[PDB]
Amino acid sequence: LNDDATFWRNARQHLVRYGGTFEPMIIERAKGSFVYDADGRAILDFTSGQMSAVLGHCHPEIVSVIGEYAGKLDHLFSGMLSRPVVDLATRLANITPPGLDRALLLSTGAESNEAAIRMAKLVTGKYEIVGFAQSWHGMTGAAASATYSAGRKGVGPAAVGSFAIPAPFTYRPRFERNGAYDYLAELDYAFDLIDRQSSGNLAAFIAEPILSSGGIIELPDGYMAALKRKCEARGMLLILDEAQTGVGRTGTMFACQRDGVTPDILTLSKTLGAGLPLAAIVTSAAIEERAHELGYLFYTTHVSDPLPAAVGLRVLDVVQRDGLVARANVMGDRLRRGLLDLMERFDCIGDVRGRGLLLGVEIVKDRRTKEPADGLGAKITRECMNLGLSMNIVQLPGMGGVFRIAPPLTVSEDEIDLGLSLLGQAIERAL
Amino acid sequence: LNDDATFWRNARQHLVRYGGTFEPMIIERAKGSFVYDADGRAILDFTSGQMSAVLGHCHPEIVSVIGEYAGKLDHLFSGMLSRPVVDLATRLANITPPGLDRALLLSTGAESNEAAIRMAKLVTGKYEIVGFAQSWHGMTGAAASATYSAGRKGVGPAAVGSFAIPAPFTYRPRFERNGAYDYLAELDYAFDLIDRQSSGNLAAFIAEPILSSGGIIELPDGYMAALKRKCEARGMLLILDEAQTGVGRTGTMFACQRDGVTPDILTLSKTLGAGLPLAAIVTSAAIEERAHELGYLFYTTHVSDPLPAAVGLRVLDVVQRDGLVARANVMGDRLRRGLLDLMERFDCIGDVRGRGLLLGVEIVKDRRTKEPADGLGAKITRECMNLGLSMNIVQLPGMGGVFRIAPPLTVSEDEIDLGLSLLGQAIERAL
Amino acid sequence: LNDDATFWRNARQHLVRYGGTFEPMIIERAKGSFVYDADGRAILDFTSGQMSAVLGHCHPEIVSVIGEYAGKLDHLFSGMLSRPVVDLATRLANITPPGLDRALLLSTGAESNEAAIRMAKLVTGKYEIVGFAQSWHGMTGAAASATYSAGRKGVGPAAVGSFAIPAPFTYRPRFERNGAYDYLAELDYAFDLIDRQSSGNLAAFIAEPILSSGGIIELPDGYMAALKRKCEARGMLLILDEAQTGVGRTGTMFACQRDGVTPDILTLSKTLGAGLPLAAIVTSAAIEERAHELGYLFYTTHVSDPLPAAVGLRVLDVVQRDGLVARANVMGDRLRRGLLDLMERFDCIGDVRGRGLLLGVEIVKDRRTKEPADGLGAKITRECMNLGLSMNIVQLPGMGGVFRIAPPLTVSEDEIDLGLSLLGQAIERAL
Amino acid sequence: LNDDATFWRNARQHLVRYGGTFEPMIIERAKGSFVYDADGRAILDFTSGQMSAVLGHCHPEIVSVIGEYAGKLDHLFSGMLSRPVVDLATRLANITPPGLDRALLLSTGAESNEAAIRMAKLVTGKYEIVGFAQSWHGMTGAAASATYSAGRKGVGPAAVGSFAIPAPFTYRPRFERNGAYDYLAELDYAFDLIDRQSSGNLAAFIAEPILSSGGIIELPDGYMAALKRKCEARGMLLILDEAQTGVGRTGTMFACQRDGVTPDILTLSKTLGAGLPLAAIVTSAAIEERAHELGYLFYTTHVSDPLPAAVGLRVLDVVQRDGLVARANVMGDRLRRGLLDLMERFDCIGDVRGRGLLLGVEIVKDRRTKEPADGLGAKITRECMNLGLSMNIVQLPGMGGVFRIAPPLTVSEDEIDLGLSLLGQAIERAL
Ligand SMILES: Cc1ncc(COP(=O)(O)O)c(CN[C@@H]2CONC2=O)c1O
Ligand SMILES: Cc1ncc(COP(=O)(O)O)c(CN[C@@H]2CONC2=O)c1O
Numbered sequence A, B, C, D: 001l002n003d004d005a006t007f008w009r010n011a012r013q014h015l016v017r018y019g020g021t022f023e024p025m026i027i028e029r030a031k032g033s034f035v036y037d038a039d040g041r042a043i044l045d046f047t048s049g050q051m052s053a054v055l056g057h058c059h060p061e062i063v064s065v066i067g068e069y070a071g072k073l074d075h076l077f078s079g080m081l082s083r084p085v086v087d088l089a090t091r092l093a094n095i096t097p098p099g100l101d102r103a104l105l106l107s108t109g110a111e112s113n114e115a116a117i118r119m120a121k122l123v124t125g126k127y128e129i130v131g132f133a134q135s136w137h138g139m140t141g142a143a144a145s146a147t148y149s150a151g152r153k154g155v156g157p158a159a160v161g162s163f164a165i166p167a168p169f170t171y172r173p174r175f176e177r178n179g180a181y182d183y184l185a186e187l188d189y190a191f192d193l194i195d196r197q198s199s200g201n202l203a204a205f206i207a208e209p210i211l212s213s214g215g216i217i218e219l220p221d222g223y224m225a226a227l228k229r230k231c232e233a234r235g236m237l238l239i240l241d242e243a244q245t246g247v248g249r250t251g252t253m254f255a256c257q258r259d260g261v262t263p264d265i266l267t268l269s270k271t272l273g274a275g276l277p278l279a280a281i282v283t284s285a286a287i288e289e290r291a292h293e294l295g296y297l298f299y300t301t302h303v304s305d306p307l308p309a310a311v312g313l314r315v316l317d318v319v320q321r322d323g324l325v326a327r328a329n330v331m332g333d334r335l336r337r338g339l340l341d342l343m344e345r346f347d348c349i350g351d352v353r354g355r356g357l358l359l360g361v362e363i364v365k366d367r368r369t370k371e372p373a374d375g376l377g378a379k380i381t382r383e384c385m386n387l388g389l390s391m392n393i394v395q396l397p398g399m400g401g402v403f404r405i406a407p408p409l410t411v412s413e414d415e416i417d418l419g420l421s422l423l424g425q426a427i428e429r430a431l
C-alpha cells in the first residue's frame, strides 16, 4: 500500500516543500502512458509526467541508448567534444527552419532560457526583456524575471528592465475595436506603452507559442508575424520558448513552423530530453558569430555531455521514424472531438482549446458569464485521480480553472478513450 | 583519427561556442580515470571531467542503477513522490551535520544555488546577497549575480543588491595588521563597508569553502566561524556552495565538517550526481517550515525525478561503503607530496595548496615576486595534453595561472604516479 | 540691441546647454504680463515665465516682502524655526481640503516630488511608483524616474520599480468599449497589467491633475475618483503634483478641489513661489506621524528658510484678497472663447482644451485625420515671437504640436485681447 | 518670549518633521554673525546657518542687489537669457581653474549633483557611480544614492550601480602597510574590489574635498591626485562637490586649487548663493560639447533665473574685493589655535581638524582609546546654546561626536574670541 508510514514519515521530515501538495500515493513503476502506485494500480498519465515524456515512460529505445552510453561515454570536461553532441547539434540544425544553424546543449528549460536571454543581451548591448503577463519560463533569475504567471512576490526586486504585455486571449477578450476584439491593435497599444517606458535598451521579447502554464493560450492568426515585426523595428531579438510545444506536440515539429515565423533564438527542453535533463538553444550563424566575437560565455558542468546528447538524438530519431508528429494530429483530433462531446454533455465546460496534443479545458460556473468555477475544477481533478487519471489544473487570475492535457505522442486510441471515459465520470461525480 | 573532417566541419557549422576552445580530439569512450580519443589514445582525467566524475567514468555500479531505473521509474509529474527521492532526501539528512534536515532535489549547480538564494530572500523578506570577489556559483541570473570571478561584463546590470567582499588569500595577502596578514581584521573591514552600503536588506552570504574557479583558495583557520558570526549578527543566512567540495573530495564528507561550522543552507551538485545532472539544497527544519508558510516555490520539470535520485543514492552508498572519503586523504597526501617534489625541481611552481583531492598549483615567473607566469601555464597545459594528461588552468587578475587538480576518488596510486610523471615531463618540455 | 557680440560670445563660451535653444534676445527688464528686450521691445509673457509668475513680473507686493525679509531674516540653520515658516505651513493647512494638515517647505518642484515619493516609500515599506506615460515631475532621480514624457534615454537604468500607465486622452482615444472610448475601462485594463508585473511592492501613484508637459491633458470626469480607489485597494498613496495647477490657475485654489478627491500627499512649487524657488508638500497628520515614527528624513540647506516662506505667504494673501482664483475663470473664459473663434477661422486648430488659465491648443494638418502638424507649430511659435508674443509648444509622439498657454492671473482683458490678436496674425503669416 | 503657545501649537499641528528636533526658540531677526530670538537674545551663528551665509546674515550688499532685481528682472522662461546669468557664468569660468569653462545655474546642492551625475552618465554611456562611505550629496534620487553617511535604510533599493569606497581618515586609520597607515594603498585596495564588482559601466566618482557631514574629514596629501588617476585609467569622470568647501571657506577660492587637481565637473551651491537658493555645475568645453551633441537635458523652472544669478555675482564680487579668501586663513588660524588651547585644557577634545574656516572638533571619552564620547557631545552642544552659541555636532558610526564649525568669512576677531569663550564654558559646564 501507499501507506508505508516509514515512507510518509521520512517524506514529512526530510523533504523541502516547493509548490503544491504531494500526491498521496507512492509511485513504484512507470511504463508507456501509465504510472503505477504501490498497490499496483495503474494511473493513466495524461500529462506525460511534468509534460516531458514524449515517448511515454521507459521507452525501450530510450532504455537502450541510456544503457549503451552509461557504460561507454558519460560525462566530460566541457572543452571536450564527442559524437553524440555534434550529431545532435547537426540534427537540430537540419530539422529546424532555415535561419537556425547552431546549437548549445544544456540541461534544463530555465537554463536554456537563461542562455538565450544572456546571448540576446550580449549581442545587442542592451538589457530590457519583454514577456507575456501570463508567461512561464523558469525558476532561475532571468527566467523568473520574465515569468509573470506566478512567483513574482516576496522574493525581492525582479531583474532591472523587466516588462510584460498582455497575451492575446480570444476566450476572454479585453481590447475592442469597432465592436471587435482586435488583438493586433492590442499589440500595437501594448508596444506603445513599452516604448514610452523603455530606457532605450530593449533587447528581446521572449514568448511561448502556446502559453501552457498561462492556461493553454494559443497566439491567434497573424499575431506572431506581427510580434516579430515589432521586434525587428526595435532592433530586438525574438526568443521562442518551445519547452512544451517543441518536438511534435502541436502537430508540427516546432510550433513556429505552423506560422512560418522563425525566431532569432529557439529554446527547447522538456520534450527534447523525454524525461531526462537535456535542453538547448538554437540560433542563427550570424548571431552565434557575433556572440562569439563578443566573448559569449555559458560554461556549465553538463553542457555538451555525451549521455544526455545521445538520448536527445534517439528521441529525434524515433519521432521522425515513427511519424509521431502526424500521430499528434490524428490522436489530437480524436481527443479534441471527445472533449467537445463532453462539453455538449456538461455546461461546466466553457472552452476546449489548444493544438495537436497540447489541449486545454476551461472550467466555468456559467457558460455565459464564463464565470470561473472555483472548487469545481479541484474536485474534478480529485475524482479523476480516484478514477485513475492524472490531470493537472492551472488556476490564474480572472480566468476559469484550466486542465492542461498532454498525453504521450505514443498514446493509443484506446488510451485516449479511457481518458475520455474517466474524465466524463469524474465530472458527473464532482457536480 | 581525431581528424574526421565531417566531424570538425559539423562542429564548426552547428555548435554555439560558449567559452574557451574545443580540444582538438574526438572523445569516443571513457572508463575509470581515463578518456580515450579516436585513435584509442588514453588520456588520464585529472579533473574528473568537469570536476564531477567522483567515481571515475562509467562506474559499473552507476551503470547498473541507471539501467535498473531507465527501464522501471524514469520521470514523473512533480507532485508525485517515489522511493529514490525519499531515500536520497533521508540519506542526505543523515549524513550532513545536525541542523540540516530537509532536502530539495534538483538538476544543476546554478539551479541549486538559485533555489537557495530564493529561499533566503523569502524567509528574510530581504534581497541583498554578499559573495566573494573571486567566486563562481553558476551562469543563471542570481547565481551569476553572485559570481565575481568572471562573466560580469557586457550583459546588463546585475541583480539589485549584489555585493562582494575580498576572499582571504594567504598566498597573496593584502591586509596587514602589525606587520601581519590579519584575515579576520580584513573580514571586519570588508563588512563595515557592506554595512555602510546596505539599504538594510542583507539576506544572505553565499560562499564556497574552497574557491575552485577562483584559484583553489581555501578559507583559512577560523575564517568560517567568523563569517557565520557576521551573518548571525546581521540576521543573514549563510549559504554554503559545496558543488566542488561536497561528497568526500576534501577528505571529509563535507568541507563544512572540517571547520565544524554548519550553514543555514547547503548546496550540492557536480559530485553528487557523479556526471549526471542531479543537485540539491539541504536546509534546517525551521527554515523549511517558514519558507513553506511563506509559500516557497521552486517547481521545475525534473525536481524529484526518480532516475537521477536513484543515481545519487548509489553514489552515496559506494562512497560510504568503499571508504572513498578516507581514500581522498590518502591519495591526496600522495599527490600533494609529489607536487611538492616538483616544486623542489622547478622554480616556476610557486604554491601547492588545497585539500584532499582538490589541489591547486600556482605557476609563477619569480618565486619571490611571485610574478605571474603568463603563457608558461598554457604551454604546460599543452604539453600535458600531448603527454596524455588532461589538466585545467584558471587564470585570474593579479594571480599566477592555476592548475586545478581533482582526480577521481577511485584514482589509483599508479595513476597518481603517472600523472605526476607526465606533469614533470610537461614542465621541462615547456620551459 | 540684442546683438551685443560680447554677450553672445560669452553665452556661447561659458554656458552649458540644457535643452532647447536660447531665444535670440537679451531680456533686460520685466513687469506685469510683459518682458522687455534690449531694444526695449515688450514681449507679452503668455507662459508666466516658466509657468510660475502667477502675479506677473515684479509684483510690487512681492518686491516689498522680499525687501522686508532680505534685510531682516534670510536663511537659517534647518533646526531653527521662524514666523514665516510656521505661518505659511498654517496657511497651507487652512486652504487645502480636510485631510491635508502638515507641510514641508522646500525649494523646487522636483525636490517636492522627491520628498513626497520618499515619504510614500517609507510609510508603506514599499518602493514601486506608478505614473502616466506622458508625465513630467522633474529632472532629479525619483522625479525623473516617474517622468515619461521625455528624458528616459541614454542616462542609465531608471529607478527600480518604475511603471507607467497611459493617461486618459479624450482628443485621441485608444481604448473602446461598445463603440465607446471607455477611459475607466482603460484604467481597469492598465491596472491589471501593473498588478501582474508588480513584485508586490506598490507604494504610490503620482499624477498631475492636468498633464502640462504632456500636452494639456485634463483627467476626464470621474477618473480621479476612480484612480484613488485603485490606490486604496492596493494600499498605495496617491501623490498629486500640482506644480502647474495649484494656487488658483485652473479656477479653483487647487485642481483637486474641482473633483473633490483629496490626495494623500499634495505637492506644490512653481506658482507657490511666484518666480522664486519655493516648493512644498502637504500631507495628512496620520501620514506625517508615521513617517516621523519611522525616522523620515529630508534635510536640505533651504528647507524652512524664512525669506522664501515669507514670499509664499504674501502670494497666498494677494491671491485670496484680490480674488485671483475667480479672475482665473473670468479671464480663462475670455481667452477660451477667443481661441475657439480662431479655430473657426483656421482649420489648423484641432483642439482647445484646458481649464481656467491653463489652456492648450493642438495644431493639426487635418482636423479629421487629426494628423499632426509638424513644422507648422514651429513657424507659428516663431511668428508669435516676432509679433511680440512669447508662446511655448510641446511636441509629443503621435500627437499634434501643442501650445501651452498660461498667462498671469493678474492678466488684463486688454492683454488677453492683444495675445489673441498677435496669435491670429502669427497663424496667417505662418500658413 | 519664545513661548508663544499659538506659535508652538501651530508648529506641532502643521509642520512635517524632517530630521532632528526643532530648536526651542523663535528666531525673529538675523544680522552678521548673529541670530536673535524672540526675547532679543543674540545667538552667535558658528555654522553660517546651514553652512551657507558666507557673508553673514543680511549683508547690505546682498540686500541691495536683491532689491535691485526683485523690482526689475525676476524670473523667466528658461529659454530666455539675461545679463546676470551670462555674467555669473562668465565669472565662474574666470575664477575656476583652467579646464572648467561652462556653467549651468540651478537652485540646490542636490540638484547640482544630479545635473552633474546625469551629464557624466550621458557622456560616458555608462551608469555606475562611486562615492565615499561617509559622503553627503543630497536628498534627491541620484544624490541620495551616492550618499552613504546616512539615509539609506527603509526607503527602497538605491540607484542601480551604486558603490562606495572608504574615505581616507587619518584620525582613525584602518589600513596599514609596514606598520604604517598607507591611505594610497587603501585606495588601491578599494578600487580593486570595485573593479571586480563593476559590470563594466563605471561612469564617475563623486567626492567632497572635505567630507563635512562625514565628520570634517580632509583628503590627505596626494590622495586626490591619486583618485583622479584611478578615474582616468577607468574612463570615469571625477565630480567634485564643493557645496561646503567652495567660494573661499578653506582658504582658497576652491578646495581643488589647494591640491592642484582639477575635476571634470565641479558643483557648487550653499556658499555660492549665500543663503538664497542658487547652485551650479561647471565643466570643461569638451564635456559640454559632447553632452550637447548627445542631447543633454536638465530643464527646470529656475534654471537661468536672473535674480538668484544676480545674487551669486554680487557674492563673488564681495569675496574678491574684500579679500575674504585670505581672511578665511587669518581667522581660521586664530580659531584653530583657540581650539588647540581648549584641547590643552580638556581631555575630551580628541582632535581638531579641517581647513581655513571649515573646522571640526572630535569629542572622545579617552584620548587614547579615542573612545567616542556619547552624550558628552550633546550636553556640550546644549550648554553652548544656553551660553548663546549655535553649534552642530554630527555623530557617525565608530567615530567620536563631531562639532562642525564654520563661521561667516566676515566673522570678526572679537566674534571668534566670544565663540572660543562660550565653547570653553560650555565644556566645563557639561563635564
Ligand atoms: C562552486 C560552484 N558552484 C556552482 C557551479 C555551477 O554549476 P553548473 O555549471 O552545473 O550549473 C559551479 C560550476 N562549475 C564551474 C562551471 O564549469 N567549471 C566550473 O569549474 C561551481 O564551481
Ligand atoms: C514554457 C516553459 N519554459 C521553461 C520552463 C522551465 O523548465 P524547467 O522547470 O525544467 O527549468 C517551463 C517549465 N514548466 C513548468 C514547470 O513545471 N511545470 C510546468 O508546466 C515551461 O513551461
Ligand SMILES: Cc1ncc(COP(=O)(O)O)c(CN[C@@H]2CONC2=O)c1O
Pocket: C299, C300, C301, C302, D050, D051, D108, D109, D110, D111, D113, D136, D137, D138, D139, D208, D212, D213, D241, D242, D243, D244, D269
Ligand atoms: C557636500 C554637500 N553636497 C550637497 C548637499 C545638498 O544640498 P541641499 O541640501 O541644498 O540640496 C549638501 C547638503 N548639506 C547638508 C544638508 O544639510 N546640512 C548639510 O550639512 C552637502 O553637504
Ligand SMILES: Cc1ncc(COP(=O)(O)O)c(CN[C@@H]2CONC2=O)c1O
Pocket: C050, C051, C108, C109, C110, C111, C113, C136, C137, C138, C139, C208, C212, C213, C241, C242, C243, C244, C269, D299, D300, D301, D302
Ligand atoms: C508638473 C510638474 N511637476 C514638477 C516639475 C519640476 O519642477 P522644477 O523644474 O522646478 O524642479 C515640473 C517642471 N516643469 C517643467 C520644467 O520646465 N518646464 C516645465 O513645464 C512640472 O511641470
Ligand SMILES: [K+]
Pocket: A075, A076, A077, A078, A079, A300, A301, A302, A303, A304, A305, B050
Ligand atoms: K561537460
Ligand SMILES: [K+]
Pocket: A050, B075, B076, B077, B078, B079, B300, B301, B302, B303, B304, B305
Ligand atoms: K518531476
Ligand SMILES: [K+]
Pocket: C075, C076, C077, C078, C079, C300, C301, C302, C303, C304, C305, D050
Ligand atoms: K534652512
Ligand SMILES: [K+]
Pocket: C050, D075, D076, D077, D078, D079, D300, D301, D302, D303, D304, D305
Ligand atoms: K528660468
Ligand code: NA
Pocket: A092, A093, A094, A095, A096, A097, A098, A099, A100, A101
Ligand atoms: Na535550420
Ligand code: NA
Pocket: B092, B093, B094, B095, B096, B097, B098, B099, B100, B101
Ligand atoms: Na543532518
Ligand code: NA
Pocket: C092, C093, C094, C095, C096, C097, C098, C099, C100, C101
Ligand atoms: Na486642510
Ligand code: NA
Pocket: D092, D093, D094, D095, D096, D097, D098, D099, D100, D101
Ligand atoms: Na576656468
